[PDB]
Amino acid sequence: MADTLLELPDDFSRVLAIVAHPDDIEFGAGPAVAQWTAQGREVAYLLVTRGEAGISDLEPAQCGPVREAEQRKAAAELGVHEVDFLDHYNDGTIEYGPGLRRDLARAVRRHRPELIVTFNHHDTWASGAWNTPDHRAVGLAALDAVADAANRWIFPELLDEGLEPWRAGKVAIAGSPHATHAVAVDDDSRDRAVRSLAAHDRYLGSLSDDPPQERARFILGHLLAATAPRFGGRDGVAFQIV
Amino acid sequence: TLLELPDDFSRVLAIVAHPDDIEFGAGPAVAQWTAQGREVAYLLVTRGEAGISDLEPAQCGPVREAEQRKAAAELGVHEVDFLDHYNDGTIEYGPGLRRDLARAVRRHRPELIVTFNHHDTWASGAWNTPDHRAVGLAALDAVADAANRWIFPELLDEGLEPWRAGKVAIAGSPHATHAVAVDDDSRDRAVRSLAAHDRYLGSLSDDPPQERARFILGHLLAATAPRFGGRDGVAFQIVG
Amino acid sequence: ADTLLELPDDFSRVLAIVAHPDDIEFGAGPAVAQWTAQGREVAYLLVTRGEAGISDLEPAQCGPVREAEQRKAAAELGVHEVDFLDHYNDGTIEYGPGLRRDLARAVRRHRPELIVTFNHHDTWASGAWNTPDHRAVGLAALDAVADAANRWIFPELLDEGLEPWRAGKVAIAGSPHATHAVAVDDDSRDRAVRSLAAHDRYLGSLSDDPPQERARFILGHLLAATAPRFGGRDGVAFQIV
Numbered sequence: 121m122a123d124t125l126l127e128l129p130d131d132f133s134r135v136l137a138i139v140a141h142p143d144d145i146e147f148g149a150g151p152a153v154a155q156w157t158a159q160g161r162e163v164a165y166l167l168v169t170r171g172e173a174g175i176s177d178l179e180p181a182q183c184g185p186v187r188e189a190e191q192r193k194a195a196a197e198l199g200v201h202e203v204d205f206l207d208h209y210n211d212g213t214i215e216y217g218p219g220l221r222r223d224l225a226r227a228v229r230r231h232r233p234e235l236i237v238t239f240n241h242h243d244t245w246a247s248g249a250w251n252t253p254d255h256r257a258v259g260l261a262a263l264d265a266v267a268d269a270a271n272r273w274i275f276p277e278l279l280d281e282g283l284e285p286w287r288a289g290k291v292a293i294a295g296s297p298h299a300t301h302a303v304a305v306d307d308d309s310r311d312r313a314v315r316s317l318a319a320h321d322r323y324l325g326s327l328s329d330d331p332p333q334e335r336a337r338f339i340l341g342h343l344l345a346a347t348a349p350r351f352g353g354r355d356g357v358a359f360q361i362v
Numbered sequence: 363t364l365l366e367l368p369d370d371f372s373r374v375l376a377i378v379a380h381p382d383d384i385e386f387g388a389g390p391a392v393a394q395w396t397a398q399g400r401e402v403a404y405l406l407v408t409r410g411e412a413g414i415s416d417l418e419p420a421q422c423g424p425v426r427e428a429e430q431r432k433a434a435a436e437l438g439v440h441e442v443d444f445l446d447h448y449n450d451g452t453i454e455y456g457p458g459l460r461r462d463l464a465r466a467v468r469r470h471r472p473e474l475i476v477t478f479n480h481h482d483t484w485a486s487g488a489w490n491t492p493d494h495r496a497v498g499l500a501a502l503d504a505v506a507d508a509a510n511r512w513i514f515p516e517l518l519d520e521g522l523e524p525w526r527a528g529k530v531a532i533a534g535s536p537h538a539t540h541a542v543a544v545d546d547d548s549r550d551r552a553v554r555s556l557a558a559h560d561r562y563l564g565s566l567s568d569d570p571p572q573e574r575a576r577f578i579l580g581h582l583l584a585a586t587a588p589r590f591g592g593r594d595g596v597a598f599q600i601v602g
Numbered sequence: 603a604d605t606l607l608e609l610p611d612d613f614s615r616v617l618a619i620v621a622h623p624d625d626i627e628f629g630a631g632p633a634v635a636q637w638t639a640q641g642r643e644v645a646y647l648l649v650t651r652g653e654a655g656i657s658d659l660e661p662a663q664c665g666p667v668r669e670a671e672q673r674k675a676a677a678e679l680g681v682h683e684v685d686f687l688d689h690y691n692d693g694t695i696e697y698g699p700g701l702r703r704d705l706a707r708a709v710r711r712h713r714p715e716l717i718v719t720f721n722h723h724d725t726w727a728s729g730a731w732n733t734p735d736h737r738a739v740g741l742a743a744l745d746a747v748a749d750a751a752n753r754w755i756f757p758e759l760l761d762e763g764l765e766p767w768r769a770g771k772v773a774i775a776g777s778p779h780a781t782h783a784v785a786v787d788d789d790s791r792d793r794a795v796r797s798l799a800a801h802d803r804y805l806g807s808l809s810d811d812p813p814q815e816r817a818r819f820i821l822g823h824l825l826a827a828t829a830p831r832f833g834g835r836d837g838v839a840f841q842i843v
C-alpha cells in the first residue's frame with residue numbers, strides 16, 4: 121500500500137461497478153459512489169450473484185431474493201438506477217475463466233463505462249485476512265474483461281448480439297491492500313452511503329444485533345477514517361488504479 | 363522476527379498434495395504437538411505416485427501410501443487419509459478439490475490446519491510445483507467453505523455440520539511469520555518419520571535414508587534459528 | 603532496484619515459448635539476434651498465431667498473415683525452427699495440464715538448455731494489466747520444466763518416443779522483476795529492428811507510423827530501459843528462474 125495516496129483524476133461520467141455479491145459495493149466503495157452520483161455521474165451495478173449463501177440462517181432459495189431486494193434498495197439510496205444480476209452463477213463457487221470474462225465483457229459493451237470499479241481480487245483483504253475465491257475470480261475476470269470488451273475478435277458472438285467493442289478508460293479496485301489513489305468524500309455523500317449500506321438489513325442483521333443504521337455508520341466510519349492519514353487528513357475511499 | 367505459535371489448539375489437520383510434504387516441511391512441529399497430547403491427522407490428495415523415477419505409478423502409489431503411514435506412526439499420527447481420483451503431478455485447483463477438503467475439515471473439526479507452501483517459489487527461491495500451488499490454495503479456501511452451511515450443500519446431506527477452523531499454518535513458506543520450537547526427542551521422531559520414505563529418498567541419492575533425513579532436517583531447523591532467537595524450530599506462515 | 607547481472611554464457615540451445623507472434627520480438631528480439639550471431643541454436647514455439655491481434659482482420663484472415671510475418675521475422679534473426687501449436691484460440695488460452703503437456707512435448711523435442719518465456723505476471727513492466735494469454739502461457743512454460751523432466755507425468759510422451767529432458771534455466775522477458783541482462787551490440791539491434799518490422803500488418807494496425815520507425819522506437823526504448831541498471835550497457839532484461 122502506498123504511503124501517499126494521489127487524487128483519483130475525475131475525467132469520467134459513466135461508471136460500471138462489477139462485483140461478486142451484494143454488499144461488496146457498499147463496503148468497498150459506497151461513499152465514492154454517493155459522491156459521484158451527487159456530482160451527476162451515471163453509475164450502474166453488475167452483480168455476478170445474489171449472495172445467496174451469505175446468511176447463515178436463510179437457505180439460498182430464500183436468501184437470494186432477499187439480498188437482491190436489499191441491493192436494489194441500497195442502490196436507490198445513492199441514485200443508482202441500473203442494477204443487473206447475472207444468471208447461472210452460484211455464490212461461493214464462482215469460477216474464473218472465459219465464460220465469466222465474456223459475461224462481463226458483454227456488460228462493459230452494453231454500458232460503455234469510462235471507469236470500471238471492481239472489488240479487491242488479491243489473496244488478502246485490506247486487513248490481511250484471507251480473501252475468497254469468489255472475489256478473486258470476479259475481480260480477475262473483470263480486469264481481464266477490459267481488454268476483451270475492446271477487442272473485436274475475442275468473443276465474436278458479442279458482435280452478433282449487437283455489441284460493438286468498447287474500451288473503458290481505467291479500472292479502480294476498491295478495498296485493495298495496494299491502494300494508490302483516493303476519492304475525497306463529503307458529509308452528505310457519507311450520510312447517503314450509510315443509508316445505502318444500512319439497507320442490507322437482514323444481511324447486517326446476520327452479523328450484528330445492533331441497529332442496521334449503527335453498524336453501517338461504524339463500518340463506513342472506519343473505511344473513511346483509515347484513508348485520511350495517507351490522503352492529507354481527508355476522509356475518502358482508497359482505490360488501486362490500473 | 364518469528365513469533366512463537368500460540369498453544370490454543372488440541373486438534374490439527376494437515377492437508378498436503380503428496381507423501382513427504384509433511385515430513386519435509388512440518389514433521390518436527392507435528393512430533394512436538396503429539397508429544398504434548400495434541401491430536402493430528404493427515405489428508406493427502408495423491409499418493410505421490412509420479413515421484414520415484416524407477417517405479418511406475420501403479421506400483422509406486424501403494425509403496426508410498428505404506429511409507430507415508432509408517433512416517434505418520436513415527437510421529438504418533440494415526441489418522442491418515444488419501445483422496446481418490448487425483449493424479450500426482452496434475453492436481454487441478456477448483457471447487458471439486460475445495461469440496462473434498464471442506465469434507466475432511468468438517469469430519470475432523472481441526473482447530474489448526476497445516477498446509478504446505480502454495481506460493482510461486484519454494485523457501486529456497488526455486489520454482490514451486492502446480493500441485494503444491496493448487497492444494498495449498500484450495501485448503502486455504504476450504505476454511506470458509508467448511509464453515510458455511512450453504513456452500514457444498516451436499517456435505518449436509520452427508521451429516522457433516524459446518525465447522526470453522528481457527529487458523530491455517532503454512533509450512534515451507536518464504537513469508538513465514540511464526541515458528542514452533544522443537545526439542546531433541548521431537549527432532550529424533552521427525553528424522554525417523556522422514557527416513558520412513560525409504561524408496562523415495564533412496565531414489566534421490568546413495569546415502570542411507572536416515573542420514574539424508576538427519577541432514578535435511580538439521581538444515582531446516584537451523585535455518586529458522588537466526589530468526590527465532592537462536593532456537594531451532596519449524597517456521598510457518600500463519601493465515602488467520 | 604538491484605543492478606542486473608550479466609546472463610551466464612553457458613548454453614548452446616534456446617527455446618522461446620510464447621503465446622503470440624510479436625511477443626518474442628517485443629520482449630527479446632535483440633537478445634535472440636545476439637544469440638544467433640554467436641552461433642547459438644534458437645527455436646520458437648508459438649501457442650497461437652495471434653489471430654485476434656489485428657483489429658481489421660478476422661481470425662481466419664489474420665492467422666495466416668501473422669504466421670508468414672512470424673516466419674519472415676524469425677528469418678531476419680537466423681531462427682529457422684518456428685513451431686506452432688494447433689487448437690488454442692488467441693485471447694482465450696486456458697492454463698492447465700493440457701497446455702503443460704504440449705509445452706513439455708516441445709521441451710523434450712528440442713532439449714533446450716535455456717527456455718525463454720514472456721512475462722506471466724499480472725502486470726506488464728509498465729504497470730498496465732497483463733493478458734490472461736500471457737499469464738497462462740508463461741505459467742505453463744515454467745511448470746513444464748519439471749513436467750518435461752519427469753518420466754511419469756504425461757506418460758504418453760514416452761510412447762511418442764520423447765525421453766525426459768531437464769532444461770537448465772528459464773529466462774522471462776518483459777518481467778517487472780528482472781534480475782539479469784544480455785548485452786546487445788549495434789549489429790544485433792539493427793537486425794532485431796528489421797525482425798520486428800517484419801510484423802508489418804500487425805504494427806501497421808497498432809499505430810499509423812511507418813512500422814520501421816515504430817520498431818526502432820520500441821526496441822530503442824527496450825534497450826535504453828536496461829542500460830542504467832547494467833553498467834550503462836544497452837541490453838535486454840530477463841527475470842531468471
Ligand SMILES: [K+]
Nearest residue numbers: 140141144255
Ligand atoms: K463479497
Ligand SMILES: [K+]
Nearest residue numbers: 379380383494
Ligand atoms: K509435494
Ligand SMILES: [K+]
Nearest residue numbers: 621622625736
Ligand atoms: K502476446
